[PDB]
Symmetry: C5
Subunit: 168 residues, 5 copies
C-alpha cells in the first residue's frame, strides 16, 4: 500500500516544545489578538506557558533579523526555540511601501528557516484594509471569519513535532 | 485547440525509484484528487506502491521546509527519496496573502532543489477561483480539463530516472 | 525635551551604540529632512553625537553595496557600527525604473543584514509622487503625516540594543 | 513586431565549442521550431553537429534543475558543455500559474550560471497568446517577425567564445 | 552651449581607477549615446582613457554573467577593474519578455557585487517606449532630459573612490 495514504489528520502533543512568538508593534490591537489566539491554541495542544517566549520588534520589516537574533539569544541562554512565529500586520497605504515591505519580509522569513534551522510560521497579515485585518484576527464587529493566530499556533506545534530539529 | 502538455518523450520505467508526495491541507478535496492522480500515473509507470511515501503540512507556505525535513527523515531512515512532489492549492481571496504566499513558496521550492539535491516537481495550484482549481484536479462538474496531478507524477518519474542523484 | 507619543515598547537607551546613516542624494531636500529626524530621535534616546556617522551615495541603487563597504570601513577604522540606516527616496516616474530599483534595493538591504551581521533599518521611501515623499519626511505643505526618519532612528536604537552583535 | 539588436561585434567562430540545448515539451510545435533555428544559426557559426547536444524535460519549471543535471552528466561523460540553451514556451492561461512559473524559472536560470559555471542563454518565451509565441518562433501564418531561436544560437556562440570557462 | 560637466556632490578624483563598461547591443543607437556620456563624464573626473575598458554582449540578459567573466578576464590580465558599468536598453514589447528580463537582470546585477567584489553601477534602461529611452540617453529630438550615461559615469568614479576594493 502507499505509505500515509488516507492517514487521518492527527493531534499534535506540544508538551515538550518551546515556541517563540516575535511580533511587530504597528497595528497593535490586531497584533495582540493574533498573539493571544496563537498562545491559546498552543496551550490547548499541550505547550507549557513557560515554554512560550514572547519578543517584539518595531515593524514587520524587522521580523526577519529580529527572529534570527531572537533564536540566537534563546540558544545562548540554554532555552532554544523549536519553532518560531513572527507576527506582523501590514496594511496597504498610498505608496508602494506595503508591497516592498511585504514582499521582502515574506521571502526573508521563508528563506530564514534554513539559517535558524527550524520552522518559521508565516504570521504576517498583508491586507488592503484594516477591516480585513480585524476580521482575520477575529475582532471585526461582524465576527465574519475567525482568529488566524489560532491556526498559526496549531501550525507551529505540528511543524515542531513532525519536523523540528529534535523530532528525529 | 492548442497544444499544451507534450507527450512523454519515452516510456520511463519508475520501478527502482522512491517518490515522496508532501501536501498541504487547505482545499483538501482538491488536494486529494491531485494526489490520487499523481499516484495513479506513477504506478502506471512502474513505481511500486511501497515506494510512494505521503507526508502532509498545514498550508502551502509550510511546503518548502516540510519538504526539506521530509527528505532528511527519509534519508535518515535509510529510505531516501529520489524525487519529491510538494502539492498545495492556493486560491485568491480578498487580501494579498495569495500573492505573497504563492510567490515565496514557488521561489523556495525551485531553490530547494540544490539543497535537497533532487528534483522537486511544481505541484502548486495558484488559482483565482475554486472552479479553476477543481477543473485542474479533474473534478469540476463538467470535467473541462484533466487532473494535473497525473502530469506531476509523470514529471517526477522522468526527472528522477533521467536526472536523479542515482541516474548517473 | 522628551515629549513622547509613539507606540510604547520600552524606552531604549542608545548611549553605548554607534549608528551609521548612509543616504542617497537624489531628492535631496526630502533626504535631508529624513536624516535630520533620524538624528534628532536618536539623540533623544541617548546616542552620542560623535557616535552618529554619516555617509552618502549617489542613488538608492548604491545603498546596498555602499552600506556593505561603509560597515567594512568603520570596522577597519576601529569604530564599528552597531546598526545602520540606509536612506533613499525613490519617486515613480514614467518608466519602470522606479519599480526595478525599488524591488532590487529593498531585497538587497533585507538580505544584507546577514552579511554585515547587524540590523539594517529600512529607510527607503518608495513613493508614487513627490508629495507623498514630502509628507513622509514631515515637510509637505499640509503636514499631513510626520517625519518617518524619526521612526527609523527609534528602530535603529531598539534593534541595536536588543539584537545587536554586542547585545548578548 | 519591431525588433532591434545587433550582430556580434564580430563573426564568432564556434568550431571549438560544445553546446547543450535542453527543451521543455509543453507547446511542442513551437519548441521544435525554436530549437531548429538555434541549431541552424550555431551550425552557420561553425559549431559542429556532433558538438550540439539535445536533452528534454516535461515543462519549463524543470529547466533549471534539468540544466544543472544535464551539465553534470555531460561533464561526467568527458563531454562538458561550454554553454547551454534552456528553451521553454509559456503561454498565459486563466490562472497565475504562467506568472509564477515564468518568474521563478527566469530567476533560477539567471542564477544557475554561477553554479554550472558557464553562460545559460535565456530561451524562454513568456507570451500572452499562442499567436505571439508562433510569431517569435517564425511560424505564425503571416511570418510577421523571425525565429528567436536563431538569436539564442548566436548568443550561445558569442558567450562561449568570449566568456566561456575555456576562453581565457 | 558647451560647459563644464562638474557637479558639487560629484567631485571625486578618478585618476587612479580602472573602469569597465560592458554593454548590450540591442537598441544600439541608444546604447552608444549612453556609453559615450559615461566615458565623457569619467574623463572629466580624471579617469584616463587607457583605464576605461569596453566589452559587449548580445542582450541585456547576458550582462550579469558577461560582467562576472569580464571582471575575471581583466584580473587575469593584471588590469583588474575597480568598478564596472553594465549598460543595456530594454523597451517593452507585446509579451512579458521585457518584465522577466528586466527583473532577473536587475536583481542579478545587484547581487553580483558581492561576487565580483566591486561596485556594479545600474546602467539598464527599462522603458515603456523608444522615445523614453531616446530621451534618457539625451538623443530625443526635443532634448527633453539629459544623458543618464553621464550620471552612471559619475557614480562609477564615486563608488570606486569611496568604496572600491582599494579605497581602504
Ligand atoms: O504607503 P504608506 O502610506 O506610507 C503605508 C505604509 C504601509 C507599510 C506600513 C507598515 C505596516 O503596515 N506594518 C508594519 O509592521 N510596518 C510597516 N512599516 C514599518 C517597517 O516595517 C519598518 O519598521 C521601518 O521601515 C524601518 O525598518
Ligand atoms: O486573502 P484572504 O481572503 O485572507 C485568502 C487567503 C488565501 C491564501 C490561503 C491559503 C491557501 O489558499 N492555500 C494554502 O495552502 N495556504 C494558505 N494560507 C495558509 C499558509 O500557507 C500558512 O499555513 C500560514 O500562513 C502559517 O504559516
Ligand atoms: O522612470 P523615469 O521617468 O526615468 C524616473 C526614474 C525613477 C528612479 C529614480 C531614482 C530616484 O528617484 N531615487 C534614487 O535614489 N535613485 C534613482 N535613480 C538612480 C539609481 O539609484 C542609481 O543611482 C543609477 O541607476 C546608477 O546606478
Ligand atoms: O493558468 P492555466 O489555465 O492553468 C495555464 C497554465 C500555463 C502554464 C503552462 C505551462 C506552459 O505554458 N509551458 C510550460 O513549459 N510548462 C507549463 N506548466 C508545466 C510546468 O512547467 C511543470 O512541468 C509542472 O508544474 C510540474 O513541475
Ligand atoms: O515582448 P516582445 O514583443 O517580444 C519584446 C521583447 C523586449 C525585450 C527585448 C530585449 C531588449 O529590449 N533589450 C535587450 O537588451 N534584450 C532583449 N532581449 C534579448 C535578451 O536580452 C537575451 O539576449 C536573449 O533572451 C537570449 O539570452
Amino acid at each position: 500500500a502507499v505509505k500515509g495514504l488516507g492517514k487521518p489528520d492527527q493531534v499534535y502533543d506540544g508538551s515538550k516544545i518551546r515556541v517563540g512568538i516575535i511580533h511587530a508593534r504597528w497595528n497593535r490591537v490586531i497584533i495582540d489578538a493574533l498573539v493571544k489566539g496563537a498562545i491559546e491554541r498552543m496551550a490547548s495542544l499541550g505547550v507549557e506557558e513557560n515554554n512560550i517566549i514572547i519578543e517584539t520588534v518595531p515593524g514587520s520589516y524587522e521580523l526577519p533579523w529580529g527572529t534570527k537574533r531572537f533564536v540566537d539569544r534563546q540558544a545562548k541562554l540554554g532555552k532554544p526555540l523549536d519553532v518560531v512565529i513572527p507576527i506582523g500586520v501590514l496594511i496597504k497605504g498610498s505608496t508602494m511601501h506595503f508591497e516592498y515591505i511585504s514582499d521582502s519580509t515574506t521571502h526573508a522569513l521563508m528563506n530564514l528557516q534554513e539559517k535558524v534551522d527550524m520552522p518559521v510560521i508565516f504570521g504576517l497579515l498583508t491586507c488592503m484594509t484594516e477591516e480585513q485585518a480585524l476580521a482575520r484576527a477575529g475582532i471585526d464587529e461582524a465576527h465574519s471569519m475567525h482568529n488566524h493566530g489560532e491556526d498559526w499556533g496549531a501550525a507551529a506545534v505540528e511543524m515542531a513535532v513532525k519536523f523540528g530539529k529534535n523530532a528525529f
